[PDB]
Amino acid sequence: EMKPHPWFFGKIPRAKAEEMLSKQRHDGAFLIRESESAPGDFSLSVKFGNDVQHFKVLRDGAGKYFLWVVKFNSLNELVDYHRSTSVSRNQQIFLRDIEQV
Ligand SMILES: [Cl-]
Ligand SMILES: [Cl-]
Structure with a gap:
């Protein structure tokens, strides 16, 4: 039952993440991508309404990952x-897997 995660898209451009997420029906649909503007950093892109919001995946000194305050030993735990718990300080948006073709 060991499957790869449906949310890791590697190095897709910010704009293509917006393109793909725009077609998703449900708020919270998301992906993790490897930022092109900041190589070696990840970004989290999320559908909300007619918008796609982007969040930097931040790192502490020890290489833990976080969006705001709570930090995690892995992207997998952060996701x-x-x-x-909402990714947003403006709306209640909860991550949910993309509907897959
Ligand atoms: Cl919450
Ligand atoms: Cl879920």
Whole structure:
């Protein structure tokens, strides 16, 4: 039952992440991509209404990952944490997997 995650898109451009997410029906649909403007950093792109919001994946000194305050030993834990705690300080948006073709 071991499957790869449906949310890791590697190095897709910010704009293509917006393109792909715009077609998703449900708020919270998201992906992790490897930033092109900041190589070696990740970004989290999320559908909300007619918009796609982007969040920097930030790192502490020890290489933990975070968006705001709570930090995680992995992108995988950061993603899962934010399935039930909002990614946004403006709306209640919870990560949910893309509907896959
Ligand atoms: Cl919350
Ligand atoms: Cl979920």
